Design a protein that fits this description.
The structure is cut from a larger assembly and holds chains A (813 residues), B (182 residues), C (135 residues) and D (285 residues). Chain B is elongated. The two termini of chain B are 16 Å apart. Helices cover 57% and strands 0% of the residues of chain B. Chain B is mainly alpha-helical. With 285 residues, chain D is an alpha+beta fold. In chain D, the strands form 2 sheets. Chain D has a 4-stranded antiparallel sheet, covered by helices on one side. A 3-stranded antiparallel sheet of chain D has the order 5-6-7, with no helix packed on it. The chains are: A alpha+beta (813), B mainly alpha (182), C alpha+beta (135), D alpha+beta (285). Chain C: It is found in: Cytoplasm; Golgi apparatus membrane; Cytoplasmic vesicle, COPI-coated vesicle membrane. Chain C: Oligomeric complex that consists of at least the alpha, beta, beta', gamma, delta, epsilon and zeta subunits.
Chain lengths: 813, 182, 135, 285
């Protein structure tokens, strides 16, 4: 009988039957239905009658079982007395020669904090005063303590009965087996006795002595219990810069992340921390101790650095461990992050050296070039390293492989003015075999800026200019680029001037030069030719032309703040980006009142009628996410009764199977068809059910992408900013205004709120409230705001859309 | 009602009573509501409102039972009491509120109050400097002798220059701030 | 009490047999055991996993969870050790875990629970000790 | 008796270089065990062949691995053991960064905090040695007057202990420590350097810190002002009455006005004695 709540009639029958097995099974079936929480008092006389005196342990044990989980509730066969049918003949049970029945009886009897059993539990310590097992003596210290807990904090429970009444706790210390139920409030002499016992311990018993009294002067003295306290005590005597090298903490710690890569990744972190405490700049974070595994002697054999190499990773162990490991290389050794990121990047970025680090997918290659290159932009020393490695990247000599390479290096030159003169000659080489945009773009920029340095350019450019591949974006990049630097410093059959001619043709003009350009018609609609066409005031010469622009870098460009940079090593970053970091007539009148922060729905129940409505009961219901914190409890609604009855309200619950409308309120009365009527007290909305939750800009952005929010409305009374009406109203449809999606200035400055919720509707809810408050001569519609809304199938989107207008209720009875 | 009218009529809730009191500005009723709200926070907030109506007797009582003996210590020369100011010093001594017990010695013309409190803190240096300057070099010396000596040292503050202040020239204090009340 | 309940669960969505040492967790016992042990106590194949602010210690046996729950704790070794001793005692009564056979020996298991953990404090048990009681 | 167990060992002079079951290569000097280097794997000392300039180790392999013995470290430490601290300092130019701090810590353990201070690269180790020596001045330079407040708080306490109040007042200033700094400082009786370190306190609601600063020789230095700043306007009125330069009339007014704005109507205050509070003609000396 797993859980069957109607079966009590059969149990009575089964409980006495003249067959002992049946009786045991019955009583067992009662236990299992109560434990789940089901019907049990009908049976009581039957249950109690067979078992009572006997020394036959199994039925007695079963009855003994049922007296610690419901004795108080059941009363057919027990009623209320001092020597109840729980203990009257269980004084026999306590005083049987078999330890088990006595012991069991003692154990339940003393366990209860019952006051209708207080006297019978007190000399119940007799059953276990003699200690036939470790179990008997432990059973005794726990039972005396449980007696002490049960209203006997004074002389009824404190001395000895004949050996224990609160003194097993003392005795246990010096006896062969220990266990101290003495944790609080008990004899001082036993506490003292436990200390002595630390030495003459029994190990289970030591965990009991130890919860009470901890800290040792020793190293130990033995056993897991003492050992477990000991690592706590050690952390005290050296708190300083974490544990560093984990103590006896290490054993539990592995299981704490049994799923399976995460342990190594964690372990790797600690091992890296431990090596050294470095400068602790941007991603140079290694704490713990400065010297404890050093770094870097030149006589150390086979050195520290061997372990450091693991941390430099491509994936060399698996991805979770990889992400931890790349950060960890950066963390022990660099200048900041820059130094060790360049080494690390050199390995990752595409080459002709190894083909286990090159790939023909263009974005990844490109990104890897940008990561290597960002280190230079960060720190100078890296410029010198980067440029020759970049030329190796080029040497791959696939159209695309060159292409990616050329694209970053060209950005580097914008930063690094006439420093990378050397690269230009390498960069031209792979520009001729071509099937893509990227190669043309980049090459034309290097060869263009670099012209003073070289003289090749008609020849290199011209094979490509009459070759094909994909050429949209090529136009833009060649347009600003081709002439640049020194007015007449090249010549192969086209000097720098031919280049300016070319540069202009490629931009949007027409001219025979480099055997004509591939295309002329520019990239995306805004860019066009014209700016540059106007430009080249002084023909490709460092002055105030293309050259200027080329040998200068747009805004601030420093660090790895992503200003001509990309922020570490490209593969590690994907993982970091991913991390969102999300945090019968009846009359009612009613108002909601709050006194001393108690929120209640006031209801007055009125019988305007002369007719009888007796049988009157009042209930507030649990609909779904609405709940009663206590229904109105008066038996009112009688002939010409006016009553004030208070129903307390909650807003947060779990969905019930009954209707999901406004608030259900139920009054009952006389009638047999409609004994229960549902009638209303004032408004509560569907919107309550939504649950508020919040987003950060990353979670908002991810969800924006994840599912559409095209749906918009413009809501009146969003004249005001985010903070005022809009927040308060948004709150009531369990929403909250978080992070921005705005871009403010002297022409821009709609207020933008990123909203989130996680509705109990199987959807989230998100929105952006844009408040069109004029920051221009031509506003949208002046003050008002357009709320762009969604939910996960946009079923709550709509709630956001209208619950940001207005919202107010009041009455004054 | 911010000038209680409706408020006067229903006042049955200990909270409504509390509210009523700040809206008048007469916190005599507040303290009782605050009492019946069984809460300290109310006593300190009504005590502050009390200081606002002007009278510090009412403030003292409240502030004493919220246990802001140190706020009181601060208030008290400002108020011009010296007898009450001493009561605060002792019952803030025990708390080791060093910006409570500490205040009052300065505020009376002689500094002796600090000297003992600081002795109990174990702040022997601070106790000597305070004492010495008032010309209570003997007490200053006691502190040095009980503890580490060396009293000779001259800090960025004086260690022996006169401390004397004439405490509160007012004969009726500002615990006795006059009022009529409308 | 430190130990709220000691419970044998079926992840059928119910507490098959369970023990409330002193009247506290009656119906409460079934809801906790029913939700949490279904997800492996929300575990990942880790003996300690804590969910809804209740420490669940467990061991899977078939579609069943033998579960120890605490919301307070005195020592690391101890919580496992009562569960462990329980796991010596449970196949003697029910031949592994299995809902029907667990159900039939509600009395056996329940009695062991009272004996093993008394007023939430982890006493010790053994298969021979268990015998005197069910004799 | 030495802490790290000797799995195998070798004598280089009277110094014992041994391997440990921790994989530590340590050397015994003085009855003290120092770690010369860390072994990454389990290694055994074949012998020290002067030719190679090396100690020859072998793994499980009947092949060679080599560790040169770190003689400069060993000689620094050995000299320290002998109680030839100066001698060990001659070695120091050829002890790097963190190693100088470590060798310094060796010097210190054996004794002489100061010689350890000169060799220790790390300023923090110098700073602590200076507290230990009781060299307040040296510890003071090491903190450095602008910031390093943690250094200064340790120094300030040390200065109060020695009852050298002077160094203490400066440490507390650099520390800032307004609450603590005031306690040492307001013992003045002339308020000589107590206003600065409580200027903030006035308007931070750290009024208490502020009142002690200003009222200390019968002067109203910024006593009143602290009270206005905080919004504890009643208290400024009250103070003004106390010392009667009859400034009360203005403070009571400003305050009374404040009652009318802060919802009082029955104690509204806008009168001269009618609506609770009392402007100066009600008041007196």
């Amino acid at each position: 009988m797993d859980s069957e709540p109607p079966s009590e009639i059969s149990l009575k029958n089964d409980l006495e039957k003249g067959d002992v097995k049946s009786k045991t099974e019955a009583l067992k079936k009662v236990i299992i239905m109560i434990l789940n929480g089901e019907k049990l008092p009908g049976l009581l006389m039957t249950i109690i009658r067979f078992v009572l005196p006997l020394q036959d342990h199994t039925i007695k044990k079963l009855l003994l079982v049922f007296w610690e989980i419901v004795p108080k509730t059941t009363p057919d066969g027990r009623l209320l007395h001092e020597m109840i049918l729980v203990c009257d003949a269980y004084r026999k049970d306590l005083q049987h020669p078999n330890e088990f029945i006595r012991g069991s009886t003692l154990r339940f009897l003393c366990k209860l904090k019952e006051a209708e059993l207080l006297e019978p539990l007190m000399p119940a310590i007799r059953a276990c005063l003699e200690h036939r097992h470790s179990y008997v003596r432990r059973n005794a210290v726990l039972a005396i303590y449980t007696i002490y807990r049960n209203f006997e904090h004074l002389i009824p429970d404190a001395p000895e009965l004949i050996h224990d009444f609160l003194v097993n706790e003392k005795d246990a210390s010096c006896k062969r087996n220990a266990f101290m139920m003495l944790i609080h409030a008990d004899q001082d002499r036993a506490l003292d006795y436990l200390s002595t016992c630390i030495d003459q311990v029994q190990t289970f018993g030591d965990i009991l002595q130890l919860v009470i009294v901890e800290l040792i002067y020793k190293v130990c003295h033995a056993n897991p219990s003492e050992r477990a306290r000991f690592i706590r005590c050690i952390y005290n005597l050296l708190q300083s810069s974490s544990p560093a090298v984990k103590y006896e903490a290490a054993g539990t710690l592995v299981t704490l992340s049994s799923a399976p890569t995460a342990i190594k990744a964690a372990a790797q972190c600690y091992i890296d921390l431990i090596i050294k405490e470095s400068d602790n700049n941007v991603k140079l974070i290694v704490l713990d101790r400065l010297v404890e595994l050093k770094e870097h002697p030149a006589h150390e054999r086979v050195l520290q650095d061997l372990v450091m190499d693991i941390l430099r990773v491509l994936s060399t162990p698996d991805l979770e461990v990889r992400k931890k490991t790349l950060q960890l290389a950066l963390d022990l050794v660099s200048s900041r992050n820059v130094e060790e990121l360049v080494i690390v990047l050199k390995k990752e970025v595409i080459k002709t050296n190894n083909v286990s680090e090159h790939e023909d997918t263009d974005k990844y290659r490109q990104l890897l070039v940008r990561t290597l290159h960002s280190c230079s932009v960060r720190f100078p020393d890296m410029a010198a390293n980067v440029i020759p490695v970049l030329m190796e990247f080029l040497s791959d000599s696939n159209e695309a492989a060159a292409a990616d390479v050329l694209e970053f290096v060209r950005e580097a030159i914008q930063r690094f003015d006439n420093l990378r003169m050397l690269i230009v000659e390498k960069m031209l080489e792979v520009f001729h075999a071509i099937k893509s945009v990227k190669i043309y773009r980049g090459a034309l920029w290097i060869l263009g800026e670099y012209c003073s340095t070289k003289e090749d350019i008609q020849s290199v450019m011209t094979e490509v200019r009459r070759s094909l591949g994909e050429i949209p974006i090529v136009e833009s990049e060649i347009k600003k680029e081709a002439g640049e630097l020194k007015p007449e410093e090249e010549i192969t059959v086209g000097p720098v001037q031919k280049l300016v001619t070319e540069m202009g043709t490629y931009a949007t003009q027409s001219a025979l030069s480099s055997s004509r350009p591939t295309k002329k018609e520019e990239d995306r609609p805004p860019l066009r030719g014209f700016l540059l066409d106007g430009d080249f005031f002084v023909a490709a010469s460092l002055a105030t032309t293309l050259t200027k622009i080329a040998l200068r870098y747009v805004a601030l460009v420093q660090e790895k703040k992503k200003q001509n940079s990309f922020v570490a090593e490209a593969m590690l970053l994907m993982a970091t980006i991913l991390h969102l970091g999300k945090s019968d007539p009846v009359y009612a009148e009613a108002y909601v009142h709050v006194n001393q922060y108690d929120i209640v729905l006031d209801v007055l129940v009125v019988n305007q009628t002369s007719d009888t409505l007796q049988n009157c009961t009042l209930e507030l219901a649990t609909l779904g996410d609405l709940k009663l914190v206590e229904k109105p409890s008066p038996l009112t609604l009688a002939p010409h009764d006016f009553a004030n009855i208070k129903a307390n309200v909650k807003v947060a619950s779990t969905e019930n199977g009954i209707i999901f409308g406004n608030i259900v309120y139920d009054v009952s009365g006389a009638a047999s068809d409609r004994n229960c009527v549902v009638l209303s007290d004032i408004h509560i909305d569907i919107m309550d059910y939504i649950q508020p939750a919040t987003c950060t800009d990353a979670e908002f952005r991810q969800m924006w992408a994840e599912f559409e929010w095209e749906n918009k409305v413009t809501v009146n009374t969003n004249m005001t900013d985010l903070n005022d009406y809009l927040q308060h109203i948004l709150k009531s449809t369990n929403m909250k205004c978080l992070t921005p999606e705005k871009a403010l200035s002297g022409y821009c400055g709609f207020m933008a709120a990123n909203l989130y919720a996680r509705s109990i509707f199987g959807e989230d809810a998100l929105a952006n409230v844009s408040i069109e408050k004029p920051v221009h001569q031509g506003p949208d519609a002046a003050v008002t705001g357009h709320i762009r809304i969604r939910a996960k199938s946009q079923g709550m989107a709509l709630s956001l859309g209208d619950k940001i207008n207005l919202s107010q209720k009041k009455t004054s009875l | 009602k911010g000038y209680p009218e409706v408020a006067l009529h229903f006042v049955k809730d200990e909270k409504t009573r509390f509210s009523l009191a700040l809206e008048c500005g007469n916190i005599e009723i507040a303290l009782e509501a605050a009492k019946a709200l069984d809460d300290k926070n109310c006593w300190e907030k009504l005590g502050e409102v009390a200081l606002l109506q002007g009278n510090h007797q009412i403030v003292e009582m409240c502030y004493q039972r919220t246990k802001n003996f140190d706020k009181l210590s601060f208030l008290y020369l400002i108020t011009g009491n010296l007898e009450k100011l001493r009561k605060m010093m002792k019952i803030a001594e025990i708390r080791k509120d060093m910006s409570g017990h500490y205040q009052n010695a300065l505020y009376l013309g002689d500094v002796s109050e600090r000297v003992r409190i600081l002795k109990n803190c174990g702040q022997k240096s601070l106790a000597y400097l305070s004492a010495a300057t008032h010309g209570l070099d003997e007490e200053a010396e006691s502190l040095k002798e009980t503890f580490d000596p060396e009293k000779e040292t001259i800090p960025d503050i004086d260690p022996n220059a006169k401390l004397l202040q004439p405490p509160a020239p007012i004969m009726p204090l500002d615990t006795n701030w006059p009022l009529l009340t409308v | 009490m430190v130990l709220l309940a000691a419970a044998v669960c079926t992840k059928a969505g119910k507490a098959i047999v369970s023990r409330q040492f002193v009247e506290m967790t009656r119906t409460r016992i079934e809801g906790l055991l029913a939700a949490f042990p279904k997800l492996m106590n929300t575990g990942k194949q880790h003996t300690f996993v804590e969910t809804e602010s209740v420490r669940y210690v467990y061991q899977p046996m078939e579609k069943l969870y033998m579960v120890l729950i605490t919301t307070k704790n005195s020592n690391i070794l101890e919580d496992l050790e009562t569960l462990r001793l329980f796991s010596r005692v449970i196949p003697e009564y029910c031949r592994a875990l299995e809902e029907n056979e667990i159900s039939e020996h509600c009395f056996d298991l329940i009695f062991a629970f009272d004996e093993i953990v008394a007023l939430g404090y982890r006493e010790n048990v053994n298969l021979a000790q268990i015998r005197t009681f069910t004799e | 008796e030495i802490q790290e167990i000797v799995k195998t060992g070798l004598w280089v002079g009277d110094c014992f270089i041994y391997t440990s079951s921790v994989n530590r290569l340590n050397y015994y000097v003085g009855g003290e065990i120092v770690t010369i280097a860390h072994l990454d794997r389990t290694m055994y000392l074949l012998g020290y062949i002067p030719k190679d300039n090396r100690l020859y180790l072998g793994d499980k392999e009947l092949n060679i691995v080599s560790y040169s013995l770190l003689v400069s470290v060993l000689e620094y430490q050995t000299a320290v053991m002998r109680r030839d601290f100066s001698m060990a300092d001659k070695v120091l130019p050829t002890i790097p960064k963190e190693q100088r701090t470590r060798v310094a810590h060796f010097l210190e353990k054996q004794g002489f905090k100061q010689q350890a201070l000169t060799v220790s690269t790390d300023p923090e180790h110098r700073f602590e040695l200076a507290l230990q020596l009781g060299e307040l001045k040296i510890a003071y330079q090491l903190a450095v007057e602008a910031e390093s407040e943690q250094k200064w708080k340790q120094l300030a306490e040390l200065a109060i202990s020695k009852c050298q109040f002077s160094l203490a007042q400066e440490c507390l200033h650099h520390a800032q420590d307004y609450g603590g700094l005031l306690l040492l400082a307001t013992a003045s009786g002339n308020a000589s350097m107590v206003n600065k370190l409580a200027e903030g306190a006035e308007r931070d609601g750290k009024n208490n810190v502020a009142f002690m600063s200003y009222f200390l020789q019968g002067k109203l230095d910024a006593c009143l002002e602290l009270l206005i700043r905080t919004g504890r306007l009643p208290e400024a009125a009250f103070l003004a009455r106390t010392y009667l330069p009859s400034q009360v009339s203005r403070v009571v007014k400003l305050w009374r006005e404040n009652l009318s704005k802060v919802n009082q109507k029955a104690a509204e205050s806008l009168a001269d004695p009618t609506e609770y509070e009392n402007l100066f003609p009600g008041l007196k000396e």
